[PDB]
Design an enzyme around this catalytic site. Structure first.
Site, PDB file in Angstrom:
ATOM      1  N   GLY A  10      30.248 -26.069   3.336  1.00 58.06           N
ATOM      2  CA  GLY A  10      29.769 -25.721   4.680  1.00 58.06           C
ATOM      3  C   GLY A  10      28.589 -24.767   4.695  1.00 58.06           C
ATOM      4  O   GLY A  10      28.156 -24.285   3.646  1.00 58.06           O
ATOM      5  N   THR A  11      28.087 -24.481   5.897  1.00 62.40           N
ATOM      6  CA  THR A  11      26.937 -23.583   6.078  1.00 62.40           C
ATOM      7  C   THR A  11      27.340 -22.130   5.810  1.00 62.40           C
ATOM      8  O   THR A  11      28.524 -21.806   5.759  1.00 62.40           O
ATOM      9  CB  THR A  11      26.300 -23.694   7.487  1.00 62.40           C
ATOM     10  OG1 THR A  11      27.210 -23.217   8.486  1.00 62.40           O
ATOM     11  CG2 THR A  11      25.887 -25.136   7.808  1.00 62.40           C
ATOM     12  N   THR A  12      26.347 -21.265   5.633  1.00 64.66           N
ATOM     13  CA  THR A  12      26.597 -19.857   5.313  1.00 64.66           C
ATOM     14  C   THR A  12      26.969 -19.067   6.578  1.00 64.66           C
ATOM     15  O   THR A  12      26.356 -19.245   7.631  1.00 64.66           O
ATOM     16  CB  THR A  12      25.375 -19.205   4.629  1.00 64.66           C
ATOM     17  OG1 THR A  12      24.910 -20.047   3.565  1.00 64.66           O
ATOM     18  CG2 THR A  12      25.726 -17.833   4.055  1.00 64.66           C
TER      19      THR A  12
END
Ligand SMILES: [Cl-]
Lengths: 244, 235, 250, 195, 240, 231, 241, 243
Positions: free
Chosen positions: H29-31
């Site tokens: 997933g994204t940060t």
């Protein structure tokens, strides 16, 4: 999920057999032999105990022959613990019938009920069947003396003489040879013990190995008596018939 | 083993796709919609000559204005028919009117995907639901065990379906009479059936506005079979 | 967050065996030796206190358990399974008997109830059998003194004397030679200590051995006076000192 | 429902039950049969609250007929009466009890004896030589105490029953519109068409 | 509760548990149904591997559902009792609410519906039983004979057989049974039923059971000696 | 492979294969386009037929007077989810006298789809949805995927060959957003967008399905000769 | 081989899932120790904060179950907290129902019975933890009772748990062989903590700063954990003699 | 083998492989990050702009619980929403019974026990998110991070998702260079920088910055989104530091 670990105890094989019922019958074929013989004036129940040890307290022991009511008894072949679950249910059904109709339960009705319970475990619920075969010995005022058997499939049938458990093929051939319709209780006692004496896997048949019972309409003034034989009384009937 | 409601890698439900294979093994059923009525016909397919063929009930009334033909595991259809009849009568009780054909079909199709680990598997039967209402007129619907339904001017289901559908492609036009549609169902049934078509192994029915849903007598169908033979011999 | 195991985990194999019951019996075989001997005027049950660490206080772990004032139990196999069975056995003695009849159950019927619980773990959904064999000794007015064995199947048998677990084959042979129907309770305790010495490796004393009797009524252990009919518990656990006294005359 | 009577003679049981059905101000019917055949040799008459009476009678009938098919056998009158009693004894501690009183007249084919059981809505069962429910018994029991003998014939039983009905027609306030009479013996159940 | 889908579709569009239930029916003892002009006869096989039996008390193969309808079967015996009980209960319930005994078609439709339900309910296997349901509707003299099977399909038959070697007896009936003129009398119908069983049974009279059902709740089971007379007459005519 | 038997099982790379297989059912479905301006929001759907005798499967479903969706994938799953939306819109009206926000509608669909992806026995939904609406903060377009992921967008497309229409809208973004107070020109842009996803077949009278919602425009569906204007 | 996935018997009479839960116990790589004084029970455990981004005050495996009972866990923190919450609820419920404070040994039995159920019932997994319960019981005095994933439990004179438990165990065994008593003959709990830390240093062969240890102390009518500064005071006293 | 096919099964290591597989979804997933400051906490997240057709500022990822707790997560977004929905029910029942708003450590355990429960049975799947959350209570500021196993700890700074290593390095510098502490307004600026620096791991598609904060002085201890001028000031600071 949980599907992974399900044995599926209530399915047909490709041949149209119930796996678990067949395997339960295989279990029962190793259990100690039980014989039932029906005469004109009574019924005999004879059965061989499995665990010979000198230190087993025999006079207080009961693995084979159980009382269901005053008129009906059973001989067990298979798992004793499974049988006791079913026995206590059958004892309750008998008393429910007595409470409702104020008459002792007819033998076939009790047999059908137990046989229907066994059937249910083969068609639904996903549980293993009961690993038990019964010989029912009983009396009622409709059909008189009756012998039935039931097995894990829930099928039941009536008999003049029958065996369950170990060496039934051999036992049933010997019974079919010596049984006659005009036979009496004393003769049937002798036939039961002689059949066990030949089919037994043990070296010799002794009092400490047997459970024995009779249902006679030879009580005082035309009643029916259930006699579960004591150890000394089994020892006496073994000497009388000429086996020891 | 594997889940009953499992998706395949192509994005289809395994059990629904497998039930469609059961429907292919079933006897043929054909429906043709016209402006004069909707005709419904079936192959009876008796397994033996001792079987009394009139007891084969593959065409069924749902209400006076809605009929139904089936193909596949026909025993599965009984609870679907029971639901359709109850839904039709219940709607009349609540609203003092006939229920729309589309709404009835939708109600039947809502049962379809109610399966899992509710019933243990999808239905193994397809239905042709034919009827009339005041809003959308004469209608024919194909109800599948996927929960989907399509309206059709004409439709065949069962073992001879793809062969029958191609024939319905050429033959159907918007100006078809009811008499013409009856003969056309008998024609296409005769083509795809294994055994020779007669009044005892095939059954006709229709739904008109005036007379409602009627299963045809064997004597009436016999005359239409005789009329068909003569008109094919005529050229 | 669902219990989906509504199906049996013990089933019949093609040979007729119930695998999980057999495997439970194998777990019982690995367990520490325990025995029971019946005398004319009493019953004795005994086992080794196999301490998992010397830092552990082995007094706190009770292998020999009171079920009713006249009934006691010992085991071989899995200790936690035994502990929960003792909890259930104590409770069922009240719920299915004392709260109905106003008296404690006879030995055979309490055994029957324990047996039932063990049978159900052999057939019910989503459970394994109990990995223990029990020896239950007891007294009641109409049956007298008795000793019962209970296995993972739910099956139970009455014994004059027996042994279960690690060295049971050897221990049962030793008991066959020594047992007779004229034994006093002290003679049975003496034979129990001799039999148990064979299966123990390390230290053999009152601190490493757990032994209890079903014997005479103990009014001194009752805790109250004033009711002539209540004469006290027949179950008594022997102390560490009481065991050591009998080991000198051994 | 008003008057139901029963009398057990030498070789039969006779049940007499009134024909009137009255709701409030009006007599709606004058030919009502307040009985159900439970089995070929067992008849049950009934009286009590409207609706409850027939519903209970037909429910018992269905159950005994089910038993008869299952076992291919006729239950004894004693067994049927015990079944009925238990159903009523269960009923009395329900949300809404059956307000129904019954007489069960049967011929036991095993013992070759007629039998008459009186059971009220509470589940109170008694076997009697003669019985009645409701206000009937206040007149009819004293009569039967005088005139009854155990060795009477069926014809003598019917005459004794006429004497009961005459007394009820003389002294009771309600017009019960006569009685339907039925005899239960070794040959089964039959209706006396002229009474 | 045990919810597991045991009856499911396979890639080729088959429900194997239903098809394997039909194999249990194939194993069962043979049963046959023949309807005449004014009667129906139900013939049943009794396998002679089982002697020393008590024929008084052993469950008979033909069961009365009501006084006017009978049910025989092929397949698992224990399973058949469950269907028979449910059918008997429904027969009394129909009398209670409709004030009329069940039609033979209605009773068949009910039994068939129970069988179907067990092919798409979780946690249950299908009945390993096919039935022949026979009798006469109330106040009707037209004979009725129906067949059901584990899938739940049912249908009416002029004559039909089920169970082991039913292929052979169905062959016999297909050539010997004429629709334009069925067995006119009880004698003719019983004879054709015994004849058809004699193709498979391969023993005298102890292995054959016959039950005759006539209009207006007239059901009677034939004895050994009565059946043995039919067996004698068939083979004496055959020697020619 | 071994990790695709049910929705309760992660693969070794942290994937849910049953959800991905459900996502595949959408790609097999017929194309549908969504787009909006500041005043109006439009759905355009290419309906699919079984054959020439059959009807064209309906793609657009009305949820309330101010909200509705178009479907691509399993139609029965779109019926279940649209019925749920109808009920939630209705609950908002009856209890709070409040038209349900389009953003909140998306959140509810997300959470409903999610529960089916984490529990055993159930399956994911096999359908993708484009929800349009006009609420108190103007015109809205949402994209629903049965993984649970819901996205607010100016325009989008889903189904077979949907990448063509999605590229067109990505170029046209600055033009069609400005089509305010002109419903016919916004529909034209939607019809021109869906045309980029066509091959072989073209837009006929009973093939095309259009819907619109806006400032003084209830959610209304146009089929048949009502869409002949835009062909 | 599905007898290794759920809690059913293998052919050897073994429960593999129970055995594998025991291995999860050492996943944290932490060693704990518990000893008894005259008036007290001390429990010490290693504290390892590898990440600089962690708030060290929230990193703990010692739990205050009730006022009288403390619990140290050897095992992963989710299962530790599961066990902690249940023990707290059980201790509070006991007080409400029976009118007195749940004894340490009784809570240990209860938690052990719950662990037993997970070894017998298939749908529930065992918790991968060993629970060491400590108190000064009003009847039994200073008390140490320990539970494991098999549902086994027993009382202890002293105990140790973790990867290097055997080294600590033998060190303690040898001390009690000399003294010939079941406890640390010491009046103040401060000196009993000093004993515990000293014998862990000797057994593990490592020095400790204030932030490398975590300490719990049970006295009559309370259990409490020591702060970093309280531990520093303990470490200074050890070094000065 | 087969130990990784079913949730709640121990492998011979003593590991639950299904939980470790859920961690891979989180890593994909994204940060997202969290920074604990003097009197509060700051949350920030990377939102990937998949297309020009995404409406700016509309697809909000950070979620509020009660009025004082902020929640952000990386991984399967729907699983995160399910966890926040439960968190809201837990916070509501706590406030209903005890009156005071749920303390942050109390709230952390409520999520922790719920996530842990989804590792106890094979009938459920573990959560495919790591969740960074916190806020201000009576005892001050608290920041937490919660993993698929149910494991959580308190943090000075926290980071998860694809850019976590990059972010963790930057957070570690702030802890060393500011022992006396960081202000709330400073933490917003630094949060913007860290997300921009962590974007080098997701550098193909351009992104949208989203920040929120709870601070005793700056927001009265309530959770608010950073908007308008204060957001642009943080973007400008972040853009200046990368160049
Ligand atoms: Cl407990």
């Amino acid at each position: 999920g949980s599907r992974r670990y399900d044995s599926r105890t209530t399915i047909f094989s490709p041949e149209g057999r119930l796996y678990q019922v067949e395997y339960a019958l295989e279990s029962i074929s190793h259990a100690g032999t039980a014989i039932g013989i029906m005469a004109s004036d009574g019924i005999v129940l004879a059965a061989e105990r499995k665990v010979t040890s000198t230190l087993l307290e025999q006079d207080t022991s009961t693995e084979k022959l159980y009382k269901l009511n005053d008129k009906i008894a059973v001989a067990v072949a298979g798992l004793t613990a499974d049988a006791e679950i079913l026995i206590n249910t059958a004892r309750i059904h008998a008393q429910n019938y007595l409470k409702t109709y104020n008459e002792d339960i007819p033998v076939e009705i009790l047999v059908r009920r137990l046989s229907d319970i066994k059937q249910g475990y083969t068609q639904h619920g996903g549980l293993r069947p009961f690993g038990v075969s019964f010989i029912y010995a009983g009396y009622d005022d409709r059909y008189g003396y009756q012998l039935y058997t039931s097995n894990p499939s829930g099928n039941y049938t009536g008999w003049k003489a029958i065996s369950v458990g170990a060496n039934t093929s051999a036992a049933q051939t010997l019974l079919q040879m010596d049984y006659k319709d005009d036979m009496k209780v004393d003769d049937a006692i002798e036939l039961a013990l002689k059949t066990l004496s030949k089919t037994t896997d043990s070296s010799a048949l002794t009092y400490d190995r047997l459970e024995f019972a009779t249902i006679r309409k030879g009580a005082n003034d035309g009643e029916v008596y259930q006699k579960i034989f004591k150890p000394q009384e089994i020892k006496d009937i073994l000497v009388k018939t000429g086996i020891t | 083993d594997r889940g009953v409601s499992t998706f395949s890698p192509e994005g289809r439900l395994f059990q629904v796709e497998y039930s469609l294979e059961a429907i292919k093994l079933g006897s043929t059923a054909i429906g043709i919609a016209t402006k004069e009525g909707v005709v419904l016909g079936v192959e009876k397919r008796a397994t033996s000559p001792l079987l009394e063929s009139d007891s084969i009930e593959k065409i069924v009334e749902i209400d006076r204005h809605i009929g139904c033909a089936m193909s596949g595991l026909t025993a599965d259809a009984r609870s679907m028919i029971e639901h359709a009849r109850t839904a039709a009568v219940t709607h009349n009780l609540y609203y003092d009117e006939d229920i729309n054909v589309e709404s009835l079909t939708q109600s039947v199709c809502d049962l379809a995907l109610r399966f899992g680990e509710l019933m243990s598997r999808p239905f193994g039967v397809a239905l042709l639901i034919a009827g009339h209402d005041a809003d959308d007129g004469y209608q024919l619907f194909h109800a599948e065990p996927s929960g989907t339904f399509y309206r059709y001017n004409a439709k065949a289901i069962g073992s001879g379906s793809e062969g029958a559908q191609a024939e319905l492609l050429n033959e159907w036009h918007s100006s078809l009479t009811l008499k013409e549609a009856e003969l056309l169902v008998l024609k296409i049934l005769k083509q795809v059936m294994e055994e020779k078509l007669d009044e005892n192994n095939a059954q006709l029915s229709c739904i008109t506005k005036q007379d409602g849903f009627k299963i045809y007598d064997n004597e009436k169908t016999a005359e239409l079979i005789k009329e068909l033979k003569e008109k094919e011999a005529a050229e | 967050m669902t219990d989906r195991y509504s199906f049996s985990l013990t089933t019949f194999s093609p040979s007729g065996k119930l695998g999980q019951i057999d495997y439970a019996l194998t777990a019982v075989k690995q367990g520490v030796t325990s025995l029971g001997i019946k005398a004319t005027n009493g019953v004795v049950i005994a086992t080794e206190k196999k301490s998992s660490s010397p830092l552990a206080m082995s007094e706190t772990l009770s292998k020999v358990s009171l079920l009713t004032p006249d009934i006691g139990a010992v085991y071989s196999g899995m200790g936690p399974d035994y502990r929960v069975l003792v909890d259930k056995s104590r409770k069922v003695a009240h719920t299915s008997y004392k709260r109905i009849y106003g008296e404690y159950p006879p030995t055979k019927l309490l055994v029957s109830e324990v047996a039932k619980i063990m049978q159900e773990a052999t057939q019910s959904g989503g459970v394994r059998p109990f990995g223990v064999s029990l020896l239950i000794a007891g007294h009641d007015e109409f049956n007298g003194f008795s000793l019962y064995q209970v296995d993972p199947s739910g099956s139970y048998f009455p014994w004059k004397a027996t042994a279960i677990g690690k060295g049971s084959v050897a221990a049962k042979t030793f008991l066959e030679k020594r047992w007779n129907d004229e034994l006093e309770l002290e003679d049975a305790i003496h034979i129990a200590l001799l039999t148990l010495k064979e299966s123990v490796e390390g230290e053999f004393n009152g601190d490493t051995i757990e032994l209890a009797i079903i014997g005479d009524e103990n009014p001194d252990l009752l805790g109250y006076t004033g009711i002539p009919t209540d004469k006290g518990p027949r179950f008594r656990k022997l102390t560490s000192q009481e065991i050591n006294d009998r080991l000198e005359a051994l | 429902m008003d008057i139901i009577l029963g009398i057990r003679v030498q070789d039969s049981v006779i049940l007499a039950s009134s024909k009137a059905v009255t709701r409030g101000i009006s007599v709606l019917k004058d030919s009502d049969d307040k009985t159900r055949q439970l089995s070929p040799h067992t008849l049950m008459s009934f009286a009590g609250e409207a609706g409850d009476t027939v519903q209970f009678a037909e429910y018992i009938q269905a159950n005994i007929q089910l038993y008869s098919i299952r076992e291919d056998y006729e239950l004894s009158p004693q067994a049927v009466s015990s079944f009925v009693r238990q159903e009523l004894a269960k009923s009395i501690r329900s949300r809404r009890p059956y307000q129904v009183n019954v007489l069960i007249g049967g011929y036991d084919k095993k013992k070759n004896k007629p039998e008459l059981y009186q059971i009220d809505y509470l589940g109170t069962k008694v076997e009697l030589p003669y019985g009645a429910h409701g206000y009937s018994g206040f007149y009819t029991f004293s009569l039967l105490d005088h005139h009854y003998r155990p060795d009477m014939t069926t014809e003598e039983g019917l005459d004794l029953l006429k004497l009961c009905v005459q007394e009820l027609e003389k002294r009771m306030p309600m017009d019960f519109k006569g009685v339907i009479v039925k005899i239960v013996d070794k040959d089964g159940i039959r209706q006396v068409d002229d009474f | 509760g045990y919810d597991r889908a045991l009856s499911i579709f396979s890639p080729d569009g088959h429900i194997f548990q239903v098809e394997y239930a039909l194999e249990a029916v194939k194993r069962g003892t043979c049963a046959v149904g023949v309807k005449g002009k004014n009667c129906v006869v139900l013939g049943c096989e009794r396998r002679s591997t089982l002697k020393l039996q008590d024929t008084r008390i052993t469950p008979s193969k033909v069961s009365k559902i009501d006084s006017h309808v009978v049910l025989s079967f092929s397949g698992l015996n224990a399973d058949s009792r469950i269907l028979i009980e449910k059918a008997r209960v429904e027969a009394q319930s129909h009398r209670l609410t409709l004030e009329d005994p069940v039609t033979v078609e209605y009773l068949t439709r009910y039994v068939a519906g129970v069988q179907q339900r067990y092919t798409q309910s979780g946690g249950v296997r299908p009945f390993g039983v096919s039935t022949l349901i026979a009798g006469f509707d109330p106040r009707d003299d037209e004979p009725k004979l129906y067949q059901t099977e584990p899938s739940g399909i049912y249908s009416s038959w002029s004559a039909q057989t089920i169970g082991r070697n039913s292929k052979t007896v169905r062959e016999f009936l297909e050539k010997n049974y004429d629709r334009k003129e069925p067995p006119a009398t009880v004698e003719e119908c019983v004879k054709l039923t015994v004849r058809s069983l004699l193709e498979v049974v391969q023993t005298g009279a102890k292995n054959i059971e016959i039950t005759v059902v006539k209009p207006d709740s007239d059901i009677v089971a034939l004895s050994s000696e009565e059946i043995n007379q039919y067996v004698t007459q068939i083979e004496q005519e055959k020697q020619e | 492979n071994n990790y695709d038997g049910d929705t309760v099982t992660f693969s070794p790379t942290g994937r849910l294969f049953q959800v991905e297989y459900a996502l595949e059912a959408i790609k097999q479905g017929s194309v549908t386009v969504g787009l909006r301006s500041n005043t109006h929001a439009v759905l355009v759907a290419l309906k699919r037929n079984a054959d020439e005798l059959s009807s064209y499967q309906k793609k657009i479903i009305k949820c309330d007077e101010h909200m509705g969706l178009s479907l691509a994938g399993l139609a029965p799953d779109a019926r279940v989810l649209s019925n749920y939306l109808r009920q939630q819109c209705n609950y908002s009206s009856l209890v709070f006298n409040r038209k349900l926000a389009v953003e909140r509608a998306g959140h509810l669909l997300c959470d409903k789809a999610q529960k089916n992806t984490q529990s055993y026995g159930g399956r994911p939904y096999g359908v993708g949805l484009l929800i349009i609406g006009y609420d108190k903060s103007g015109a809205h377009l949402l994209e629903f995927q049965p993984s649970g992921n819901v996205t607010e967008l100016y325009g989008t497309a889903i189904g077979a060959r949907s990448q063509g229409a999605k590229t067109y809208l990505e170029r046209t973004l600055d033009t069609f957003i400005k089509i305010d107070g002109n419903p016919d020109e916004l529909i034209k842009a939607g019809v021109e967008a869906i045309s980029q996803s066509l091959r072989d077949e073209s837009l006929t009278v009973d093939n095309l399905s259009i819907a619109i919602v806006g400032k003084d425009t209830p959610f209304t569906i146009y089929d048949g000769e009502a869409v002949a204007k835009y062909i | 081989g599905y007898d290794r996935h759920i809690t059913i018997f293998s052919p050897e009479g073994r429960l593999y899932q129970v055995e594998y839960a025991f291995k999860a116990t050492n996943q944290t790589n932490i060693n704990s120790l518990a000893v008894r004084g005259k008036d007290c029970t001390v429990v010490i455990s290693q504290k390892k904060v590898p990440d600089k981004l962690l708030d060290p005050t929230t990193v703990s495996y010692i739990f205050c179950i009730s006022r009288t009972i403390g619990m140290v866990v050897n095992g992963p923190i989710p299962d530790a907290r599961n066990a902690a919450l249940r023990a707290k609820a059980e201790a509070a419920e006991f007080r409400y129902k029976y009118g007195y404070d749940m004894p340490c040994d009784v809570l240990a039995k209860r938690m052990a019975n719950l662990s037993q159920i997970y070894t017998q019932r298939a749908y529930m997994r065992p918790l991968g933890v060993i629970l060491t319960f400590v108190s000064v019981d009003e009847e039994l005095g200073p008390s140490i009772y320990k539970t494991d994933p098999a549902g086994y439990y027993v009382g202890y004179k002293a105990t140790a748990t973790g990867p290097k438990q055997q080294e600590i165990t033998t060190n303690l065994e040898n001390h009690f062989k000399k003294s010939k008593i079941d406890h640390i003959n010491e009046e103040s709990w401060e000196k009993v903590v000093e004993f515990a830390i000293t014998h862990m240093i000797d057994a593990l062969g490592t020095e400790f700063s204030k932030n490398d240890l975590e300490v719990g102390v049970a006295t009559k009518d309370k259990f409490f954990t020591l702060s970093a500064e309280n531990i520093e005071e303990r470490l200074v006293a050890i070094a000065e003699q | 083998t087969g130990y990784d096919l079913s949730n709640s099964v121990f492998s011979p290591d003593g590991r639950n492989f299904q939980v470790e597989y859920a961690v891979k979804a989180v890593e994909n997933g994204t940060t997202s990050i969290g920074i604990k400051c003097n009197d509060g906490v700051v949350f920030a997240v990377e939102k990937l702009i998949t297309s020009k057709l995404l409406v700016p500022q509309k697809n909000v990822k950070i979620q509020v619980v009660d009025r004082h707790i902020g929640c952000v997560y990386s991984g399967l977004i729907p699983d995160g929403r399910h966890l926040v929905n439960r968190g809201r029910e837990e916070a509501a029942s706590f406030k209903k019974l005890y009156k005071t708003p749920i303390p942050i450590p109390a709230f952390a355990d409520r999520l922790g026990q719920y996530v842990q429960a989804h590792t106890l049975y094979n009938s459920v799947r573990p959560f495919g998110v790591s969740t960074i959350f916190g806020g201000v209570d009576k005892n001050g500021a608290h920041l937490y991070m919660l993993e698929p196993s149910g494991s959580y700890w308190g943090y000075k700074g926290a980071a998860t998702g694809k850019g976590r290593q990059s972010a963790k390095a930057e957070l570690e510098k702030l802890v060393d260079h500011h022992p006396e502490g960081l202000s709330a307004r400073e933490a917003v600026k630094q949060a913007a920088k860290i997300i921009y620096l962590a974007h080098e791991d997701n550098k193909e598609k351009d992104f949208e910055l989203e920040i929120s904060w709870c601070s005793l002085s700056e927001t009265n201890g309530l959770h608010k989104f950073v908007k308008g001028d204060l957001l642009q000031e943080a973007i400008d600071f972040a853009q200046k530091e990368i160049n």
